Amino acid sequence: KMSFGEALEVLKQGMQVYRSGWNGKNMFLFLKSSDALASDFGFGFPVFGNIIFIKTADNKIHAWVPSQTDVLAEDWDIV
Amino acid sequence: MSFGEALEVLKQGMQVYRSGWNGKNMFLFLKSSDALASDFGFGFGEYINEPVFGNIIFIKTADNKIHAWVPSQTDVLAEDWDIV
Amino acid sequence: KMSFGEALEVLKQGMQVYRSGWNGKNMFLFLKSSDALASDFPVFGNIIFIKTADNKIHAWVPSQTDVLAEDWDIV
Amino acid sequence: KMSFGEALEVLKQGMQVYRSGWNGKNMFLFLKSSDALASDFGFGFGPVFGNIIFIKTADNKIHAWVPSQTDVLAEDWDIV
Numbered sequence A: 001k002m003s004f005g006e007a008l009e010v011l012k013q014g015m016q017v018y019r020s021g022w023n024g025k026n027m028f029l030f031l032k033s034s035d036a037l038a039s040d041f042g043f044g045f046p047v048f049g050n051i052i053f054i055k056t057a058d059n060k061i062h063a064w065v066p067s068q069t070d071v072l073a074e075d076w077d078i079v
Numbered sequence B: 001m002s003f004g005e006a007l008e009v010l011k012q013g014m015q016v017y018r019s020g021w022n023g024k025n026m027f028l029f030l031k032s033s034d035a036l037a038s039d040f041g042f043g044f045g046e047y048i049n050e051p052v053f054g055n056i057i058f059i060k061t062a063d064n065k066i067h068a069w070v071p072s073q074t075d076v077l078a079e080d081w082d083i084v
Numbered sequence C: 001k002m003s004f005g006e007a008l009e010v011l012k013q014g015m016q017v018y019r020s021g022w023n024g025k026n027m028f029l030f031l032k033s034s035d036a037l038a039s040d041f042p043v044f045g046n047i048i049f050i051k052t053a054d055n056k057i058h059a060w061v062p063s064q065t066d067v068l069a070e071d072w073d074i075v
Numbered sequence D: 001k002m003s004f005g006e007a008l009e010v011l012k013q014g015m016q017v018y019r020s021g022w023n024g025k026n027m028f029l030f031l032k033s034s035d036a037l038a039s040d041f042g043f044g045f046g047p048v049f050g051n052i053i054f055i056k057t058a059d060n061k062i063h064a065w066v067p068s069q070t071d072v073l074a075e076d077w078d079i080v
């Protein structure tokens, strides 16, 4: 059981994290830097910020919204 | 404009903003799953399965960067939306 | 069923809403004024709470899927 | 303190925090405990209230706070 602060630092360093308290299964977060996104996103418009994604239960890729439940929780772990 | 009306404008591909925001010249824009897949990827090597995105809403922020838009309670409840 | 815009007005009118597409069951949203804080210790906005799958009350944070979805229903 | 994880610990101890990089000036966050919330709202004594983070905005409005991803990743947090 990691705090959100611990999970956050690990996410910053390129690891994947998740909460056991989430309802959906097999989900996780991953962080992409501005440089990574400048290459990955080919759809035209220039400069991305850092974006955290959540791989969801249906295996789709979404933007992760930091819920208060998530940020206050201490049930985080590393994939 | 309510947020419900701003959402309908977003789903039509146009850009929306709140006057009550602090940062200037910001706006939201929506990219669909099909749009995000178009020319997506590092382009070197092959995925087992092509990534499938959900819809993503971006915000063009006051420093002219592109971020993921987190819908705030203030945003969602506000009545000060407009089209760019 | 309902759009998020419709769910928001139902919330403002004192009813409870949820998405049928959520993973967790037995959850819902409800809205109150934050002016209940005035007695503690400014313009008070409304607050959207979530009653969670593990029976807690938190301040709700919409995902992008939540606000784009058309599967909202009334409790 | 600097990171968001540190700011959350400051919030939990009852102090106020802000980001110097925010566009709005003189804003801050504060956290109310389950006990304080149940007393204020009249329910959730234990369905039980959790903690809730609020924001006082630059226009003097009070809302439940929603973190942006930039907020959570930022290192410019400070104590009021």
Ligand SMILES: Nc1ncnc2c1ncn2[C@@H]1O[C@@H]2COP(=O)(O)OP(=O)(O)OC[C@H]3O[C@@H](O[C@H]2[C@H]1O)[C@H](O)[C@@H]3O
Pocket (backbone or CB within 6 Å): A021, A022, A023, A024, A025, A054, A056, A057, A062, A063, A064, A065, A067, B054, C021, C022, C023, C024, C025, C060, C061, C062, C063, C064, C065, C066
């Ligand atoms: N298809 C998704 N698209 C975007 N984002 C998603 C998806 N799927 C999951 N998320 C995010 O993971 C968190 C935990 O997942 P979860 O426990 O399974 O959520 P849920 O039961 O479906 O309820 C929903 C509430 O959860 C909170 O955080 C959720 C979501 O932010 C939110 O406030 C939700 O309103």
Ligand SMILES: Nc1ncnc2c1ncn2[C@@H]1O[C@@H]2COP(=O)(O)OP(=O)(O)OC[C@H]3O[C@@H](O[C@H]2[C@H]1O)[C@H](O)[C@@H]3O
Pocket (backbone or CB within 6 Å): A049, B020, B021, B022, B023, B024, B059, B061, B062, B067, B068, B069, B070, B072, D021, D022, D023, D024, D065, D066, D067, D068, D069, D070, D071
């Ligand atoms: N570089 C950004 N990166 C990501 N997201 C951003 C950025 N810049 C702006 N946003 C988003 O637009 C909203 C309105 O913009 P804003 O009025 O100028 O925000 P603010 O004064 O800087 O921060 C105070 C609070 O605003 C709320 O919504 C903000 C942000 O979600 C949040 O809860 C903030 O914690």
Ligand SMILES: [Mg+2]
Pocket (backbone or CB within 6 Å): A038, A039, A040, A041, A042, B039, B041, B042, B043
């Ligand atoms: Mg590219």
